[PDB]
């Protein structure tokens, strides 16, 4: 027909090897920018003054790092929450010093990943599917917004966002424990149950479907060729798996509806992970984990320590050592 | 559509009550997190100046001013980690501010006792505390029963905003699926993908 | 926290394999449940879709073909073999926990992966060399000295205030 | 960086040897 429509039909085409779509129009360039900046910085970025104290932290392979110690380093505390595009710097040299690649990378990524989510909806609509896969992905997405966006906001600086690195991630976890007692927070307890329980049910669902595969092969061939793709029928006896697992425990602790069984597998880790990301997002505003320090005392008033008091000694050692040259006054209020 | 709208609004509300001390007066709601962090620096400038410190020339350990430094556009601001927070503006502090930021002459001469009081009150009421309402940092001992209304209101309204965004996606996608006629699953007799050419 | 400050357990390849196996299990769990729930066939005329499944039916209750296409085109690959997919689900988390179990046996012996020697040799000579690796070690030292007297009472650790390690102010 | 110099040969063979094993087995499947 006309140009705009031939292009609109190419964009929303269900015959492209990779679906594009309108979300895909924003997604592709922003992931490409984030990915290219990240690969170049990880390898070659010079040191970055993360805490605003003129104490640059080296994160790149060419400056003495390996895969496990390297990272793209958060922008400086002197910036705090100010926007810092390249064009705001007097030179790439200044920008590199003050941590600009980190801001470039996380905005293009957060943006491109939010459109990933919409793309999952978009292609399900062109395919005639039910639409809620994207809802599941929102649990990891939301977790990423937490450590890269929400937590910096509440604490007033992208310098306290999660670093883009293996060791940098551990750094962020430890400082989080000292400053918020995340282990004592119920939302993170909900997150562990989230992912332990997910892996559990993952091993269980697989183990129980693999246990009930229908003999379709001989002992010399992979069982896997007993299934052919798009075949009309099922390749395991669910009645048989219910009979096994219903007896492992008792009959009604066992699912016999395929649909109920899979919705359960979707919902458990999604919700848990919603809670732990909700928990990072509310500790962004210093609503922290339970505090039972010196909560038990005797007739006279002596402190009878509990395990919570031992945790606080750990927390305290992280507290006093982190960012060792960055505090001039006795409280660490952000 | 309305779930989408309300989500956006709870997020804005979240940020309003955390940063804004005009329609959320700190007289009523306690200090903002930046306000408390700034008030801590003021406290210890005052005390040390009383003892005899020349606070404008005090080099701290990093080479940055212990008490006063420049922001990245040059303004004079409180030192230490609160450098992230120099955008703070509050009626107890604006008095000491000149054209290039904090005025050292006003710091030396014009700090009233009401400001020393506000500044100490606000740093000891910083919006930090635990879920069972022990107030302070996480390593604090029980004693002080306090969690700032700013924390209670911003946390609760982020949670709500997030779950209403999830609401949007759930109901928006369902509403599209339903108006197209495949909200209840794929039609076995007409499975669209089967009329599609293979990707390879 | 003990394992962080004494063993540096986060830096350990065997825990990293376990972590990948657990978070990977949770990933497969969620994404397979959502794929089945969002490719289901219409097998009843009601809005609750759960009531359209009989355990004894022969037919697959969802479309493997359309699921595959979705993921081929969203992610570039998809599963095509339903047996392989469920075996992989048993495999990933089960193999993760086994790998973490191996690392702990090393910690029984204090055979930690605590350091990178090359980093220490440089940091010791070069006081401007700082990485996240060295920041994390300083945190460990803090954990050890602050928690041990009370974590290990039987040792009667006495640390005068002046030997406790601390940054400025805190 | 004063790294361990057998690290190169250890990484190299750690990659090469099992990768050659798989390639040997894939190509001789394709030709039957």
């Amino acid at each position: 027909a006309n140009l705009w429509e031939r292009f609109c039909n190419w964009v929303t085409s269900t015959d492209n090897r990779l679906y594009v779509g309108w979300f895909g129009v924003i997604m592709i360039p922003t992931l490409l920018a984030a990915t290219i900046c990240f690969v170049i910085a990880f390898i070659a970025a010079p040191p970055v003054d993360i805490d605003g104290i003129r104490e640059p932290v080296s994160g790149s392979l060419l400056y003495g790092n390996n895969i496990i110690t390297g990272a793209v380093v958060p922008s400086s505390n002197a910036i705090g929450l100010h926007f810092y595009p390249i064009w705001e710097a007097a030179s790439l040299d200044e920008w590199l010093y003050n941590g600009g690649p980190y801001q470039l990378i996380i905005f293009h990524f957060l943006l491109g990943a939010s459109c990933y989510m919409g793309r999952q909806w978009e292609l399900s609509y062109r395919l005639g599917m039910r639409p809620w896969i994207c809802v599941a992905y929102s649990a990891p997405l939301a977790s990423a917004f937490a450590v890269f966006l929400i937590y910096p906001i509440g604490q007033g600086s992208f310098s306290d966002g999660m670093p883009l690195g293996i060791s940098g991630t551990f750094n962020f976890m430890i400082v989080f424990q000292a400053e918020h007692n995340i282990l004592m927070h119920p939302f993170h307890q909900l997150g562990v149950a989230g992912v332990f329980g997910g892996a559990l049910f993952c091993a269980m669902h697989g183990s129980l479907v693999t246990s009930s595969l229908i003999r379709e092969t001989t002992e010399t061939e992979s069982a896997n060729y007993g299934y052919k793709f798009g075949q009309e029928e099922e390749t395991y006896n669910i009645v048989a798996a219910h009979g096994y697992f219903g007896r492992l425990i008792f009959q009604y602790a066992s699912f016999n509806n395929s649909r109920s069984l899979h919705f359960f597998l979707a919902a458990w880790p999604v919700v848990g992970v919603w809670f732990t990301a909700l928990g990072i997002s509310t500790m962004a505003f210093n609503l922290n984990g339970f505090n039972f320090n010196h909560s038990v005392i005797d007739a006279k008033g002596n402190v009878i320590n509990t395990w919570a008091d031992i945790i606080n000694r750990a927390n305290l050692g992280m507290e006093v050592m982190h960012e060792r040259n960055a505090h001039n006054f006795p409280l660490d209020l952000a | 559509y309305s779930l989408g709208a309300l989500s956006m609004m709870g997020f804005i509300a979240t940020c309003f009550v955390w940063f804004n001390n005009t329609v959320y007066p700190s007289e009523f709601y306690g200090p903002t997190g930046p306000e408390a962090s700034q008030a801590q620096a003021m406290t210890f400038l005052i005390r040390d100046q009383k003892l005899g410190a020349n606070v404008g020339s005090a080099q701290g350990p990093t080479g940055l001013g212990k008490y006063l430094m420049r922001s990245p556009t040059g303004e004079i601001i409180f030192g230490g980690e609160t450098m992230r927070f120099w955008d703070f503006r509050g009626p107890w502090l604006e008095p000491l501010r000149g054209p290039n930021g904090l005025d050292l002459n006003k710091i030396k001469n014009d700090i009233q006792p009401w400001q020393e009081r506000r500044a100490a009150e606000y740093m000891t009421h910083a919006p930090l505390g635990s879920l069972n309402s022990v107030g302070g940092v996480a390593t604090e001992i029980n004693s002080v029963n306090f969690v700032s209304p700013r924390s209670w209101l911003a946390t609760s309204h982020f949670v709500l905003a997030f779950f209403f965004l999830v609401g949007h996606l759930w109901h928006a996608g369902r509403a599209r699926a339903a108006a197209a006629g495949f909200e209840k699953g794929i039609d076995r007799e007409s499975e669209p993908v089967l009329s599609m050419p293979s990707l390879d | 926290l003990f394992f962080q400050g004494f063993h540096n357990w986060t830096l350990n390849p065997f825990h990293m394999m376990g972590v990948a196996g657990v978070l990977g299990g949770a990933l497969l769990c969620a994404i397979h449940g959502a794929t089945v729930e969002n490719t289901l066939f219409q097998d009843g005329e009601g809005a609750s879709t759960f009531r359209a499944f009989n355990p004894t039916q022969a037919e697959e209750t969802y479309s493997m073909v359309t699921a595959n296409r979705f993921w081929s085109q969203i992610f570039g690959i998809a599963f095509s073999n339903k047996r392989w997919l469920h075996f992989f689900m048993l495999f990933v988390p089960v193999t993760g926990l086994w790998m973490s179990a191996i690392g702990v046996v090393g910690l029984a012996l204090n055979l930690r992966s605590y350091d990178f020697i090359s980093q220490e040799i440089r940091a010791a000579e070069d006081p401007e060399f700082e990485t996240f690796y060295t920041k994390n070690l300083l945190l460990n030292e803090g954990i050890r000295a602050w928690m041990a007297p009370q974590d290990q009472p039987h040792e009667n650790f006495v640390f005068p205030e002046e030997v406790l390690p601390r940054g400025n102010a805190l | 960086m004063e790294v361990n110099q057998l690290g190169l040969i250890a990484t190299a063979l750690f990659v090469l040897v099992p990768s050659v094993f798989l390639i040997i087995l894939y190509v001789q499947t394709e030709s039957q």
Binding site: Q231 | S198, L199 | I77, A78 | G7, L8
Partner: peptide, 30 residues
Amino acid sequence: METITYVFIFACIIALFFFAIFFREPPRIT
């Protein structure tokens, strides 16, 4: 030399992505 090794392995993995997507066994429907 160590940087070169880390980057080479990373580069090979990106190459493997490309072939695994674009040169996969094409799934078909018996």
